[PDB]
Each structure stands twice: as C-alpha cells, then as structure tokens.
Amino acid sequence: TLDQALYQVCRISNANNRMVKGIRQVSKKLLDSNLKLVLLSNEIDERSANIIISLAKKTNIPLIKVDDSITLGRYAGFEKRTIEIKVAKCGCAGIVDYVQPSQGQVFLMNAIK
C-alpha cells in the first residue's frame, strides 16, 4: 500500500534536512521550483486548496493528497509520547531530494506515472 511508501519517503527525507513543513514554505519552494510529491490534506479551506493546487500545477511537478492532516502529521514526524503516542497535525508538505534510494520512492513514482 502507498501509505507505507510515503512513510519510507518521509522518514529518510527528514533525517537529512530535505522535508519541508507548512503551506508558506511549500509556496516559496513551488515558486523556487526545487521540490517533489507535494502532499495536500483534507480539512483546508477551498481558497487555500486553490492556492496549492494552482501553484503545484504551474510548477509542473507531481501532486498528491492524504485522507487527513493527522495522517500527514505522522509522516512529518510531529508525533510525541502521551505516557502510548499522539500525533500533532500538519497541513501541507513536500520533499527536496531523495538522499538514498528506496522501494517506496519507486512505487510512488509509478503511482504518479
């Protein structure tokens, strides 16, 4: 399943500093045109979606979505100990480069292609 493929992308992409969190930084990275696999999430306003979608198309790179902002929060590694664990939400995110190859990167690029 592609959910684990995103896990395999995001962890390695944030150990080395190559995963960017937050709508504002995603915006400047789309403009600067040095990014891949932008994650949208569900709960955002129609205007805010329209911004990301419009830019992400204009940048001419792969775009994707995930079922909740808490599902993205796990990928971003915002998770923390309750005692058990809880996940802080993240809205939108993307990767700068793949630092080492992984099967999840291939599976995702094939899901795009």
Applying CB under 8 A, the residues found at the interface with another protein are: 11-12, 15-17, 23-24, 48, 51, 54, 57-58, 100
Output the smallest distance, CB 81 to another protein, in A: 15
Of 58 and 86, nearer to another protein (C-beta) is 58
State the DSSP H helix or E strand holding residue 86, giving kind and residue range, or none if neither.
strand 85-86
Output the smallest distance, CB 33 to another protein, in A: 13
Of 44 and 109, nearer to another protein (C-beta) is 44
State the DSSP H helix or E strand holding residue 5, giving kind and residue range, or none if neither.
helix 2-15
Q: Is the Cβ–Cβ distance between 6 and 62 less than 8 Å?
A: no
Output the smallest distance, CB 54 to another protein, in A: 7
> Which residues, including other chains, have CB under 8 Å from residue 105's CB and lie 6 or more apart?
5, 8, 9, 98
Of 47 and 113, nearer to another protein (C-beta) is 47
Output the smallest distance, CB 112 to another protein, in A: 22
